[PDB]
C-alpha cells in the first residue's frame, strides 16, 4: 500500500484527498510539498477530507498527502516549562532560532521538545531490573527548573517489568532512560512520551474539589470562588477584562503551573505575557524566582490558521493533564473558547454540515463538554500517590456582547463558575467588570468546609455582602423613578455600603501595586470592615428611630465622614511594603474606631 | 528563483454563477492562484481560485462576471498566488484598490513580490508596543493614548467627521523614519479627494502611499485593498524599518464586501449575515500591526468604521472590537452640539495605554488622572439620566458638581480645533484644571501621593 495519497480538492482550511483508502478518522497527515499538518475530519470512500492545521494558500491538486497512523498528538517531557508553542505543539522559540525570521514559515517540521539539550535525571531509587511498573509510575525526577521538579512517568498505555533503568546523570530527549519487557516484548522509553490529544489521560479516581483557587482578585476569591479542579467561564464583551483576569490568575494564584492558551487571541497578548512573566516573580524557600519558570504558553493568535485553534485547545489541556499526573495543581487559561467554537463553525461550514444556531455545528455542546470535563482534582495513575488537578478558565467572548449566544449558553450548562463581565462596568472603567447579579459559583458548599477551618468569620460576611448588593439593585429600581428622598435611613445605609462595596471592594486595579494582587487576608479584612460599618450603622438607626433622638444616614456621614474615607482607603494598603501584622492591625483599628464612633451617636 | 514554466491559458469556462467562473480540464489547479481573464471584447480581468476539485477551478473574478462567455473567455493561470510589486517608491504615490497606479505615473518597479496575505508574525518575535505616540488630540493623548505599533480603530456613526479626525491624526501624529499608508474601501470621490488633497496640501506626499477603492469601483477589490496597503506597510516597516502608520477607511465597506461574497458563495452566516469566519478575516488585516524583534520599524494602524445604525453590538464594530487593542469612539451626542472632535471617552479605551504612560513616556500622574476623568464623566452621565426624571431639586450639591464637570469636560477636554495641537502634558494640566472642581476627598480613583503632588497645582 502507498504511504501517501494525493490532494483531490481544497476549500480554505479543508482539503479532500484521493487514494486515502485505509486512513483513520482523526489520523494526522502531511499535505503538500511543504508538508502542512492536517487531520482527517471525514472519510468518503477511497478518499478523505482533511482539516489542514496550516494555511492552504498555494496547495495544488495532485500534491502528496502523507499518512502517518498517528492521531493529533503532543510530545510531553522536559523543556515544556517556560517555552511558547503554536497550536500544534511546535516551539515558537526554536522556529525563530532556526529560521532567523520574524514570521512562522509554513510547514516547519521542528521537533516539539529539544534533543540537543541534556537534562539532569534522578531515577526514583526504589525501581530496579525485575521490578513491576505500570502507566503513570514516576520512574525519575528531571530537575527542569528551580520551581518545577519534572516527574518523568511511564506513558498511561504502557506497563511491564523493568528491564533497564538509567543511573543518575545527564540525558537528552532521545536517550533511553527506561526499558520494559511485557509478554516477552521489549519497550524502550526516552524522557519524552507522545499522547493523542483527543483522548483523556486516565486517572485512578476524579476526587471532589475542596480547596479554593485563590486568585489575584477580591470579587473572585470572596464572592464567586473558583476551586482547584473547577470548571470556570468568563463570558464577556470586548474590552471587559477577560484577559486581564486570565493574566491575573496566571500571574497571581496558588496554582503550581499555568498553561496559558492564546487560542484565537490578539497578537500582543502573547507579547504582554512574554514581557511580564520573566520579570514578575514568586518566592519559594526564601528565593525570588520568575513566574515564567511555572508557565507554558500555547499561542495561536487570531491571524494564525483557523484550524489550529482547535488543536491549540486540545494541546493546552493535554499539557495540563500531563502536569496534573505529576500531582501539580495545574491551572489552564483558554483566552477564547468562542474563537475555538468559530473554528468548529468554519470547518463545519467547509464540510457543508447542517448548523444548529448562528452557524455553529450541532456537536459544539459535546466538544465543549469533553473539554471542561478534563478538569478536576484527581488521584493520579501509578505507584506513588498524587492529588494533582486541572482548573480550567474559559474566557468566552460572546458575539455582540450578548449572553444568549450559543457558546455562552452551552458553556454555562457545563461550567460550575460564571464570572459574567458587563460592558457597562468596563465602560465606566469599573474593573474587574464582573457583574455580581448574574455571576455564580456552584462550589460554595464544597468550599464552606475550607472557610470554616481557615477563615471561620468569612461565610457570614460573604452572605451579607451578596445580600447588601442584591438590596441595592432592588432599591435602585425604585429610586430611578422617584428619587433618593423616598428611601428609609436603613436603606440609605444599604445603598451607601453597597457603593463602598462597589467602589472599594469589588473594584480592584490590576496594574497599580496596591491592587496588582490582593491576598485573602487583605480581602476578608476589607470586607469585615465594610460589613462592620453596615451592621453598626443599621443598628444605630434601628435603635434610635423608636425615639426623638433618631440617628440618620446624614447624621452618621457628618459624624463619621473620616471613617467613610478610611474605609475606602483600605485598598491602598500594599502587601509588598506593609507586613501582614501591619495591615491586620490597621484593619483592627478601623473596627475599634467605628465601634467607638457609633457608641458616641447612641 | 523565478517560475520559468510557461502559463497555460484555458477557454474551458464550464459555468458562471454570481462572481464565480468555474474552469474545467485544468492541469493541477493551485488553490488561491491568480488567473487573468480575457473577455470576448478583449477586456482584461483578474480572479482568484477560491476552490479546487480534480480538473475544476472556481475562479472568483475581481472586476465581476458581467460579459464572461463560456466559449470566447480566455483564462491565463499565472501558476502563483496574488503578489504585490512592493518598493520604497510606493511612497509619494496613489493606486486603485487592485494596486494599479492612478496618479498617471508608471507601474511600480518591484523591489520584492510579497505575498499579499503576508505571514503570521511569530508571537515570540512580536515586540510589545510600549512607546507612546502623541496624536495631538487631548481626547486621545490624555485618556486613550496610542502606542507605537498599536492597532486602534476610530468607530463612528454615519455622517460624523471621522475622516477629519483621521486626517488630523496623519497631520499631528508624532512620538512623545516615519511614513503613512492610507487605504480606502468604497469611499465616495468627495471623500477620496479630501484625503488626497489634505496629504498634498500638508506636503506629506513624499512619506505617504494611498490605495483608493472608490464607491463605484468593483466591490471584490475591497477585500484585497487593505491587504495591499498592509503588504506595502510590511515592506516599509520590516524590510525598510520605517515607523508606518496605516489608515484603513471604512472597514465597514470591507465587511460589506465579505457579506456580498458569502451571500454569493452561500457560505455559513454569523450575525447579520456576515461570514461565520469574519473574525479570522478581519484578524488577517488587523494583526499585521506592531513592532518586531531586531527591526527599528513598526506598523501602527488606525482603522476607521461607520457603525451601522449606531449599533455598538453590530458584527463589524463587535469583531473589530475583539481584535483591535482599544477603540476610539465618536458620537452624534457630541457632534450635534458642535463638539469637534466628537470623541466620546466613556465607551472608549486603549488596551496598550497602561504601558504607554508614566515615567520616561509621560508625567507620573497620567495613569491616575485618566481613571478619575472616566469616573467623573461617567457619574456626570448617570446624574444627568437621574435629572431627566427627578429634576435638579433631587440632585445633591455633589451631583450638580458632576454636571458642571460634564459641561467643563466636553467644552475644555474634548473640544479642540482641527489645527490645534495639544501635548499630553498640556492635556493633563487641563485634566487637573477639571478634577480640581471637586474637593480632594471626592477623587476616589487617585492615590494620596498623586493628589499631594498634583491636586493643588
Amino acid at each position: 500500500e502507498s504511504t501517501f495519497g494525493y490532494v483531490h480538492g481544497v476549500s480554505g482550511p479543508v482539503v479532500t484527498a484521493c487514494d486515502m483508502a485505509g486512513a483513520a478518522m482523526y489520523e494526522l497527515v502531511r499535505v503538500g510539498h511543504s508538508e502542512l499538518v492536517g487531520e482527517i475530519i471525514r472519510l468518503e470512500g477511497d478518499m478523505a477530507t482533511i482539516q489542514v492545521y496550516e494555511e492552504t494558500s498555494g496547495v495544488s491538486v495532485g500534491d502528496p498527502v502523507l499518512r502517518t497512523g498517528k492521531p493529533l498528538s503532543v510530545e510531553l517531557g522536559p523543556g515544556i516549562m517556560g517555552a511558547i508553542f503554536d497550536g500544534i505543539q511546535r516551539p515558537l522559540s526554536d522556529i525563530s532560532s532556526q529560521t532567523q525570521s520574524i514570521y512562522i514559515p509554513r510547514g516547519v517540521n521542528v521537533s516539539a521538545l529539544s534533543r540537543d539539550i541534556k537534562w539532569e535525571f534522578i531515577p526514583s531509587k526504589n525501581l530496579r531490573v525485575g521490578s513491576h511498573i505500570t502507566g503513570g509510575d514516576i520512574y525519575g525526577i528531571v530537575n527542569e527548573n528551580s520551581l518545577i521538579k519534572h516527574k518523568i512517568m511511564l506513558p498511561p498505555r504502557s506497563r511491564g517489568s523493568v528491564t533497564y533503568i538509567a543511573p543518575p546523570g545527564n540525558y537528552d530527549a532521545s536517550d533511553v532512560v527506561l526499558e520494559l519487557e511485557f509478554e516477552g516484548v521489549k519497550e524502550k522509553l526516552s524522557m519524552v512520551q507522545v499522547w493523542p490529544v483527543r483522548q483523556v489521560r486516565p486517572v485512578t479516581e476524579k476526587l471532589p474539589a475542596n480547596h479554593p483557587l485563590l486568585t489575584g482578585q477580591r470579587v473572585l476569591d470572596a464572592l464567586f470562588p473558583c476551586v482547584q479542579g473547577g470548571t470556570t467561564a468568563i463570558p464577556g464583551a470586548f474590552g471587559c477584562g477577560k484577559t486581564v483576569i486570565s493574566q491575573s490568575l496566571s500571574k497571581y494564584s496558588n496554582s503550581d503551573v499555568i498553561i496559558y492558551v492564546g487560542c484565537g487571541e490578539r497578537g500582543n497578548e502573547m507579547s504582554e505575557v512574554l514581557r511580564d512573566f520573566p520579570e514578575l516573580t514568586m518566592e519559594v524557600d526564601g528565593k525570588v524566582e520568575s513566574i515564567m519558570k511555572r508557565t507554558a504558553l500555547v499561542a495561536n493568535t487570531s491571524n494564525m490558521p483557523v484550524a489550529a485553534r482547535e488543536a491549540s485547545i486540545y494541546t493546552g489541556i493535554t499539557l495540563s493533564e500531563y502536569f496534573r499526573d505529576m500531582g501539580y495543581h495545574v491551572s489552564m487559561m483558554a483566552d477564547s473558547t468562542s474563537r475555538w467554537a468559530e473554528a468548529l463553525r468554519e470547518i463545519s461550514g467547509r464540510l457543508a454540515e447542517m448548523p444548529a444556531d448562528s452557524g455553529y455545528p450541532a456537536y459544539l455542546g459535546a466538544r465543549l463538554a469533553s473539554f471542561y470535563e478534563r478538569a478536576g482534582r484527581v488521584k493520579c495513575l501509578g505507584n506513588p500517590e498524587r492529588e494533582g488537578s486541572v482548573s480550567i478558565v474559559g474566557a468566552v467572548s460572546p458575539p455582540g456582547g450578548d449572553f444568549s449566544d450559543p457558546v455562552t449558553s452551552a458553556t454555562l450548562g457545563i461550567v460550575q463558575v460564571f464570572w459574567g463581565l458587563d460592558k457597562k462596568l468596563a465602560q465606566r472603567k469599573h474593573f474587574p467588570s464582573v457583574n455580581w447579579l448574574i455571576s455564580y459559583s456552584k462550589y460554595m458548599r464544597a468550599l464552606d468546609e475550607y472557610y470554616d477551618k481557615h477563615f471561620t468569620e468569612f461565610v457570614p460576611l460573604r452572605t451579607k455582602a451578596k445580600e447588601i448588593l442584591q438590596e441595592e439593585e432592588d432599591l435602585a429600581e425604585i429610586v430611578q423613578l422617584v428619587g433618593k428622598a423616598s428611601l428609609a435611613e436603613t436603606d440609605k445605609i444599604t445603598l451607601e455600603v453597597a457603593k463602598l462595596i462597589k467602589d472599594d471592594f469589588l473594584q480592584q486595579n490590576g496594574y497599580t501595586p496596591y491592587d496588582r494582587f490582593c491576598p485573602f487576608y487583605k480581602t476578608v479584612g476589607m470586607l469585615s470592615n465594610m460589613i462592620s460599618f453596615y451592621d453598626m450603622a443599621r443598628r444605630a438607626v434601628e435603635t434610635t428611630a423608636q425615639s426623638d433622638n433618631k440617628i440618620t444616614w446624614s447624621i452618621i456621614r457628618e459624624h463619621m465622614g473620616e471613617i467613610l474615607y478610611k474605609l475606602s482607603s483600605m485598598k491602598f494598603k500594599d502587601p509588598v511594603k506593609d507586613g501582614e501584622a501591619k495591615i491586620k492591625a490597621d484593619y483592627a483599628q478601623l473596627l475599634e474606631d467605628m465601634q467607638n464612633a457609633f457608641r458616641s451617636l447612641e | 528563483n523565478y517560475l520559468s514554466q510557461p502559463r497555460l491559458t484555458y477557454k474551458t469556462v464550464s459555468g458562471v454563477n454570481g462572481p464565480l467562473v468555474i474552469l474545467d480540464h485544468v492541469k493541477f489547479p493551485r488553490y488561491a492562484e491568480i488567473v487573468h481573464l480575457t473577455l470576448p471584447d478583449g477586456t482584461k480581468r483578474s480572479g482568484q481560485v477560491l476552490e479546487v476539485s480534480g480538473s475544476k477551478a472556481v475562479v472568483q473574478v475581481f472586476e465581476g462576471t458581467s460579459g464572461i462567455d463560456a466559449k470566447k473567455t480566455s483564462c491565463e493561470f499565472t501558476g502563483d498566488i496574488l503578489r504585490t510589486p512592493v518598493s520604497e517608491d510606493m511612497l509619494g504615490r496613489v493606486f486603485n484598490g487592485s494596486g494599479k497606479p492612478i496618479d498617471r505615473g508608471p507601474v511600480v518597479l518591484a523591489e520584492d513580490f510579497l505575498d499579499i496575505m503576508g505571514q503570521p508574525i511569530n508571537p515570540q518575535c512580536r515586540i510589545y508596543p510600549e512607546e507612546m505616540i502623541q496624536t495631538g488630540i487631548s481626547a486621545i493623548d490624555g485618556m486613550n493614548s496610542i502606542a507605537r505599533g498599536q492597532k486602534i480603530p476610530i468607530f463612528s456613526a454615519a455622517g460624523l467627521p471621522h475622516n477629519e479626525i483621521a486626517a488630523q491624526i496623519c497631520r499631528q501624529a508624532g512620538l512623545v523614519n516615519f511614513a503613512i499608508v492610507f487605504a480606502a474601501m468604497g469611499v465616495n470621490m468627495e471623500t477620496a479627494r479630501f484625503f488626497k488633497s489634505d496629504f498634498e496640501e500638508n506636503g506629506s506626499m513624499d512619506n505617504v502611499c494611498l490605495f483608493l477603492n472608490l464607491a463605484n469601483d468593483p466591490t471584490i477589490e475591497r477585500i484585497i485593498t487593505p491587504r495591499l496597503a498592509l503588504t506595502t506597510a510590511e515592506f516599509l516597516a520590516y524590510q525598510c524599518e520605517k515607523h508606518v502608520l496605516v489608515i484603513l477607511t471604512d472597514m465597514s465597506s470591507y465587511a460589506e464586501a465579505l457579506r456580498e461574497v458569502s451571500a454569493a458563495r452561500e457560505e455559513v452566516p454569523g450575525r447579520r449575515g456576515f461570514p461565520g469566519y469574519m473574525y479570522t478575516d478581519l484578524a488577517t488585516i488587523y494583526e499585521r500591526a506592531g513592532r518586531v524583534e531586531g527591526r527599528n520599524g513598526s506598523i501602527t494602524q488606525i482603522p476607521i468604521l461607520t457603525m451601522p445604525n449606531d449599533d455598538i453590538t453590530h458584527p463589524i464594530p463587535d469583531l473589530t472590537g475583539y481584535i483591535t487593542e482599544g477603540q476610539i469612539y465618536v458620537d452624534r451626542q457630541l457632534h450635534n452640539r458642535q463638539i469637534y472632535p466628537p470623541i466620546n471617552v466613556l465607551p472608549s479605551l486603549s488596551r496598550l495605554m497602561k504601558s504607554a504612560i508614566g515615567e520616561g513616556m509621560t508625567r507620573k500622574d497620567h495613569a491616575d488622572v485618566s481613571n478619575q476623568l472616566y469616573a467623573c464623566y461617567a457619574i456626570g452621565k448617570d446624574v444627568q439620566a437621574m435629572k431627566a426624571v427627578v429634576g435638579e431639586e433631587a440632585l445633591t450639591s455633589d451631583d450638580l458638581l458632576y454636571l458642571e464637570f460634564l459641561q467643563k469636560f466636553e467644552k475644555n477636554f474634548i473640544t479642540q480645533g482641527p489645527y490645534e495641537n495639544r501635548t499630553v502634558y498640556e492635556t493633563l494640566d487641563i485634566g487637573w484644571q477639571l478634577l480640581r472642581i471637586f474637593p480632594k476627598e471626592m477623587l476616589k480613583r487617585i492615590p494620596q501621593s498623586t493628589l499631594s503632588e498634583f491636586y493643588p497645582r
Binding site: 457543508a352 447542517m354 448548523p355 452557524g359 | 452561500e266 455559513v268 452566516p269
Partner: peptide, 23 residues
Amino acid sequence: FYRLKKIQEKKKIIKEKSEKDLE
C-alpha cells in the same frame, strides 16, 4: 433560510447523482 437553502442544494446534488447512476 440558510438551512433550507442547503437542504435544497443537497436534494439537487442527489438528483444529479441519480441522473449519473442512470447512465
